[PDB]
């Protein structure tokens, strides 16, 4: 048999609702349609289950609807959460009856759970060092746009901070890397049309 | 809590699976590799103790060991690259929610590497501590300091926050592992109220290849 | 140092080689059972990685393991009472004496029996302790004094004294072993020279059902 | 193939020669022939080959008449021990010329040694006891010929003598039991058509 999930990567907004599609191309009498769920830690969790001749399955905020003439089957989500960001597969159990059958799978729909909208929040720019490499801590931001330059003279080594998400709704950010004049390297923040530097908080 | 394991070419691995199953009768055996589906591979049976192999796969590839009531290992031979990925374990248990259907419960995961480089020998993770900026504490009164770890291999690892006193591991922020020249680097980094500045706080790291297979113990000095 | 593994019916065994050999390229395997002779149950190639059985034996009962370099193990499928045996390990070496002809060399036996009892739990050797008589030291001047294990199964088991100072082993004697309802039983005794009357002595016990798996010492007062 | 050996068990003194006999039927036109040997704790120890073509093996104290005519192989020890008491067996290497061939083994002949003819000698009667059970320990003697019996007024268990070699030369024994009263309890000897009693040692 063969399942389909044309889908790669979706991105939605907190508290709003999602579908995803599977088309299953079947030759057998009776079956059953199972939902899953792994988490980026390769671990896998049973999540619904439809049936053939039983009506709309819904288990608290899981609502499946199902078309038995072009079988297609469409996953819902009423609320989101910023733990559902996980890759969501379609199963299909052949018959579905027996303790010695398998599972066929699709190959999976990741999502993923954004912020919703905050006012302008202005960075705040620290510095901490050790040995030889430096970083520059920046604080809360809103925007995600924002470009850091660290003024120095010999460069080794300069990587991507981060994109992370802090619990308070504004994003945070480390950026990394090390130079060889290491007494006293500052860097230079830029939000909002802005340059906020690193000295000006003491 | 998934793991790793690591071997050279032209040599066996073992795989084992941790369910908790009583009225045990069949174990399905898969693997998830990247790009790719899911996909079943063999199945083995309690009671008469026979390996069922799928259509296309050779014989002497696929092992199923009990070394004691209730427990199952699966042993793989002659690896070569193509081999690589995460493996489960599966039995048709109704069940864990204890419901009228039969659903077929999941394992943990395996990460399996096949190497052939075999270069360096300390490839365990190395630390180092930044110490927060006490400029840092006097504007909002709160400590953030950064853990650095480097020089790993391979990329699965893991990081937690502790406070040296309970059993409760402290939310805290996480970075994303970059690869520098065939080797792996990672850090993260926390924050500290005011309120417990003076009490001292850990971070331990979960890898493969620890020394002496224990977790490794990141000691942070309170905040003066 | 034949060691023992017991095992009831329908269930699996290992059996560990003992060999160290680092340019091998086939291992055997052969059985000894009661009043017949050795026969070899099958080989191993070492490069292609597999298994080659005999004439009569099902497939799927004997796998090959290796669980790291120049390591190797036995692993057996569906036990029945026939199965019990001695097992061991061989490959042709020119060799252990530094010869010239191809000669096969054979590990160290390991005995599996195969039960369907399950009677008992507390399976070790029980010690019990014989101090000389007071006649004995006066008249000869020297001292000889006895040591008693009871209640045990299997019966595979060993026997040293020690004198707590030196790591070397005294010269005792040995009974035999004798069939007690279902167990067995053991004793043995040493001689002690009257130099060696305040000194200490030990007496230790090597079997597959001791506590935590490690070997009694056993403490006789000077 | 087939691999014979007729006798179960023989009997020597020490200082002595003895011989065991293996007969074979092969159908090779070269072969090897194995002589093994098995210690009471299961050790298997290489002790000489023969060879189809080679002429009478001789190594230490191992030598091999070998009958190619009436396939017929004998294996001969000069001076025994005491350490000499284990099975030997007879062993076809089919063929025994590349890695791969395997053996033919026999059913084993097992010897046993026993010590020289000494003059005679009397027991000494000793006895310990703890608890209950209580064992009566009869000293050097000879010959090995004795009925060593515990009177005592009731017994509930009783066991056979343990005669063992000595590193003298003459035998030492131990005969256990347990009884209800064991506070007088004493060993009767009768050896060499006298009997020594164990309070004439007090």
């Known amino acids: 048999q063969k399942v389909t999930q044309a889908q790669s990567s979706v991105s939605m907004p907190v508290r709003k609702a999602v579908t995803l599609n599977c088309l299953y191309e079947?030759?057998?009498?009776?079956?059953?349609i199972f939902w899953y769920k792994q988490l980026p830690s390769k671990e896998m969790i049973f999540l619904i289950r439809?049936?053939?001749?039983?009506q709309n399955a819904k288990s608290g905020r899981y609502s499946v609807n199902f078309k038995k003439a072009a079988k297609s089957v469409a996953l819902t989500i009423s609320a989101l959460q910023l733990e559902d960001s996980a890759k969501y597969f379609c199963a299909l159990g052949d018959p579905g009856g027996l303790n010695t059958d398998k599972l066929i799978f699709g190959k999976g729909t990741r999502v993923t759970v954004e912020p919703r909208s905050q006012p302008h929040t202005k960075p705040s720019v620290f510095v901490m060092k050790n040995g030889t490499n430096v970083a520059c801590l920046v604080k809360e931001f809103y925007p995600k746009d924002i470009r850091i330059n660290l003024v120095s003279s010999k460069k080794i080594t300069e990587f991507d901070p981060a994109i992370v998400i802090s619990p308070s709704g504004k994003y945070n950010a480390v950026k990394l890397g090390k130079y060889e004049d290491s007494n006293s390297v500052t860097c230079s923040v830029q939000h909002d049309n802005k340059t906020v530097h690193s000295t000006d908080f003491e | 809590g998934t793991k790793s394991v690591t071997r050279p070419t032209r040599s066996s691995a073992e795989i084992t699976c941790d369910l908790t199953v009583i009225n045990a009768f069949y174990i399905h055996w898969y693997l998830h590799q990247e790009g790719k589906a899911p996909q079943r591979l063999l199945y083995?049976?309690?009671?008469?103790?026979?390996?069922?192999?799928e259509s296309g796969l050779s014989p002497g590839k696929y092992y199923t060991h009990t070394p004691r009531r209730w427990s199952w290992i699966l042993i793989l031979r002659n690896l070569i690259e193509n081999d690589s990925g995460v493996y489960y374990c599966?039995?048709?248990?109704?069940?864990?929610?204890?419901?009228?259907?039969?659903?077929?419960?999941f394992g943990s995961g395996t990460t399996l590497v096949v190497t052939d480089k075999q270069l360096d020998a300390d490839v365990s993770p190395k630390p180092t501590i930044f110490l927060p900026s006490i400029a840092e504490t006097k504007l909002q009164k709160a400590g953030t300091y950064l853990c650095l770890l480097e020089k790993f291999f391979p990329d699965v690892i893991k990081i937690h926050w502790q406070e040296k006193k309970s059993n409760t591991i402290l939310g805290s922020q996480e970075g994303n592992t970059m690869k520098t020249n065939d080797t792996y680097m990672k850090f993260s980094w926390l924050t500290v109220p005011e309120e417990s500045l003076d009490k001292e706080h850990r971070c331990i790291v979960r890898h493969e290849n620890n020394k002496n297979g224990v977790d490794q113990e990141i000691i942070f000095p309170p905040i003066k | 140092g034949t060691k023992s593994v017991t095992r009831p019916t329908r269930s699996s065994a290992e059996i560990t080689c003992d060999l160290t050999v680092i340019n091998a390229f086939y291992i055997h395997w052969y059985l000894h059972q009661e009043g017949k002779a050795p026969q070899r149950?099958?080989?191993?190639?070492?490069?292609?990685?597999?298994?080659?059985?005999?004439?009569?034996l099902s497939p799927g009962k004997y796998y090959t393991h290796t669980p790291r370099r120049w390591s190797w193990i036995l692993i057996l499928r569906n036990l029945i009472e026939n199965d019990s045996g001695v097992?061991?390990?061989?490959?042709?070496?020119?060799?252990?004496?530094?010869?010239?002809?191809?000669?096969?060399?054979?590990?160290?036996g390991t005995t599996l029996v195969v039960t369907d009892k399950q009677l008992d739990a507390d399976v070790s050797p029980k010690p019990t302790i014989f101090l000389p008589s007071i006649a004995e030291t006066k008249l000869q001047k020297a001292g000889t004094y006895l040591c008693l294990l009871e209640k045990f199964f299997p019966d595979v088991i060993k026997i040293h004294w020690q004198e707590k100072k030196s790591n070397t082993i005294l010269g005792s004697q040995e009974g035999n072993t004798m069939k007690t309802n279902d167990t067995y039983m053991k004793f043995s005794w040493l001689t002690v020279p009257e130099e060696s009357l305040d000194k200490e002595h030990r007496c230790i016990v090597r079997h597959e059902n001791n506590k935590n798996g490690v070997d009694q010492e056993i403490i006789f007062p000077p | 193939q087939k691999v014979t050996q007729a006798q179960s068990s023989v009997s020597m003194p020490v200082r002595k020669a003895v011989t065991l006999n293996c007969?074979?039927?092969?159908?090779?036109?070269?072969?090897?022939?194995?002589?093994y040997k098995q210690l009471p704790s299961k050790e298997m120890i290489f002790?000489?080959?023969?060879?189809?073509?080679?002429?009478?093996?001789k190594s230490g104290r191992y030598s091999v008449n070998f009958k190619k005519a009436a396939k017929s192989v004998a294996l001969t020890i000069s001076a025994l021990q005491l350490e000499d008491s284990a099975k030997y067996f007879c062993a076809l290497g089919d063929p025994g010329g590349l890695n791969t061939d395997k053996l033919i083994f026999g059913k084993g002949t097992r010897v046993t040694v026993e010590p020289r003819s000494q003059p005679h000698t009397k027991p000494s009667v000793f006895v310990m006891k703890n608890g209950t059970n209580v064992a009566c320990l009869v000293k050097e003697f000879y010959p090995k010929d004795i009925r060593i019996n515990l009177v005592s007024s009731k017994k509930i268990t009783e066991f056979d003598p343990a005669i063992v070699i000595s590193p003298s030369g003459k035998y030492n024994a131990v005969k256990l039991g347990k009884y209800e009263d064991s506070n007088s309890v004493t060993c009767s000897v009768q050896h060499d058509n006298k009997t020594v009693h164990s309070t004439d040692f007090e």
């Open positions: 439809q049936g053939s001749d039983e």
């Open positions: 079947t030759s057998w009498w009776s079956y059953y």
């Open positions: 083995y049976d309690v009671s008469n103790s026979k390996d069922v192999l």
């Open positions: 599966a039995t048709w248990d109704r069940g864990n929610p204890k419901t009228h259907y039969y659903k077929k419960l």
